[PDB]
């Protein structure tokens, strides 16, 4: 169960810290049983993504939860659903157990809303795993969000709406394989959680309380809070990620600067401006070329390398030991016995 950290970039690791697996103790679901478990059960709503699981032999048995999914008292993924008394929708939320969710008539967030007022007579809801066109008078509870339906990792996709759930999985696992480029860039079009991802993951360093900046080294940003205190914030210059991706904190604040509480002092391995950034927005034409892009091939403009655009720093840690043989200790010396 305890695994190597998945730091190919903050996102990847973070997710690897919120995964739910089948296999394990050997006593619980092992290798044999499957198809009934492996399928996306009805209750999996807001509690488990239906796109997240690993496209491979071990599919559906390993998956990260959803956006607003929270383990209450005993391991029962509850999902936030807001209350709607009569034709009135509330800003109050109930984290409901899987079981209780069935006793009610629940509706989707897409329902035209005037505030507390539901707007259409024949508006969708789903009793118990069954799609049902219910009246505004039967709508007991409503979905809290579209985000809560999926995982964080997935929530980062632009128009998820127009993409086949099948390939959307690919897109979600692809992010998990994102390598940090010395030049980060946030999407020209984002969903809305890039900010929250970097923040909740521990990529960028944020300011505790308001104050001014004292020194802005390449290795430290000693900020001065208005409370009459100042603290030195080291920046993991160049560190070795478990999978060999660079993790450097590049200061974004100049000398002597009044900082707002919780503002990026330095950017995470992959952040541009407090926003998640991987790869780099690039102008792209979408046509066929000779054969260079034939089944799934990509043609790239030399220009992309002229500017240090897709470039990334690696680090492999070679290691050797001086062992004690009964034939004589293995000395480690500049002496290389035979030729130059």
């Amino acid at each position: 169960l305890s695994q190597f950290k998945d730091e190919t970039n903050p996102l990847s690791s973070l997710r690897h810290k919120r995964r739910i697996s089948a296999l394990g103790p050997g006593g619980l679901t092992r290798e044999r049983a499957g198809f009934d478990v492996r399928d996306v059960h009805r209750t999996h709503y807001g509690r488990i993504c239906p796109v997240e699981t690993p496209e491979g032999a071990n599919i559906g048995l390993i998956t990260s939860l959803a956006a607003y999914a929270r383990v209450d008292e005993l391991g029962f993924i509850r999902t936030p659903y807001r209350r709607v008394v009569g034709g009135v929708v509330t800003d109050e939320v109930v984290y409901m157990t899987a079981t209780e969710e069935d006793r009610y008539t629940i509706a989707q967030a897409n329902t035209p809303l005037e505030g507390n007022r539901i707007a259409a007579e024949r508006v969708v809801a789903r009793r118990k795993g069954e799609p049902v066109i219910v009246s505004p008078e039967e709508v007991e509870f409503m979905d809290v969000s579209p985000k809560q339906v999926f995982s964080v990792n997935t929530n980062l996709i632009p128009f998820l709406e127009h993409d086949d759930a099948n390939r959307a999985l690919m897109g979600s696992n692809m992010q998990t394989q994102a390598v940090p480029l010395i030049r980060a860039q946030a999407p020209v079009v984002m969903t809305g959680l890039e900010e929250r991802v970097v923040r909740d993951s521990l990529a960028a360093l944020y300011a505790e309380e308001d104050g001014e900046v004292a020194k802005v080294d390449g290795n430290r940003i000693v900020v001065r809070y208005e409370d009459g205190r100042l603290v030195e914030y080291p920046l993991r210059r160049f560190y070795r990620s478990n999978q060999g991706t660079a993790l450097d904190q590049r200061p974004r604040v100049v000398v002597g600067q009044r900082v707002r509480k919780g503002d990026l002092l330095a950017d995470g391995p992959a952040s541009e401006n407090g926003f998640l950034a991987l790869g780099q927005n690039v102008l792209v034409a979408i046509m066929p070329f000779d054969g260079y892009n034939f089944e799934d091939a990509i043609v790239i403009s030399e220009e992309l390398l002229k500017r240090d655009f897709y470039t990334s720093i690696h680090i492999e840690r070679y290691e050797i030991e001086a062992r004690d043989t009964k034939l004589g200790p293995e000395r480690i010396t500049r002496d290389i016995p035979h030729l130059s």
Partner: protein
Amino acid sequence: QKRKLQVGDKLANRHGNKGVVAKILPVEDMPHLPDGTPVDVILNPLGVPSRMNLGQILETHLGLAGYFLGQRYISPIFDGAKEPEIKELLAQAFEVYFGKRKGEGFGVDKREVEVLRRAEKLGLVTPGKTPEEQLKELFLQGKVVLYDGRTGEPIEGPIVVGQMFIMKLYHMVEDKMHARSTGPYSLITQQPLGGKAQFGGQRFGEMEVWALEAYGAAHTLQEMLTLKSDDIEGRNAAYEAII
């Protein structure tokens, strides 16, 4: 070590379009827009119908707007941007694109008009309207005219283009293309084994055997079973002979 992009590398957007670099073109001749700015990457269309993620084609369209309009946007999961709102920003972008073009001193190409002709015969532009007006329509559709770059002629029929985010994927140890001539051998099993510096041989599985069996590859299979992996006295005399 600095890992600059190269042909062997694999990049993929957030939608799922995954793929490898097959050729790095000289800015000299890749697809270029009317104003001298050229495209960085050219994605194959074909990979989009089969797979079903139009979201990427939707991104590229908002992207085009964000390019000329110099702005980034935030399109929520299912609540986000709508087709009319994007056509709206594309409209705003046409003015930055073509508006400056009007003032900077010039109008439309022989090429620009030519592709318009083939475009109306297609059904992308309302026949009878002025090129200026026609191009707006065409732009709002997300595609613009592109010239070859190698020939300078246009690419018959508007092509879409835009700001698509694309990541580069980590290279596994396997990526390190293995390749072994001769090397160690297991102690009990006399078959090739690698490890630290010698690459370790590839596996010839039954499925592969049959593949050769089907063919009249008699010796070639023998070799795979003898000279190449287990024939102790075989491989040795094998090398020497080759030598």
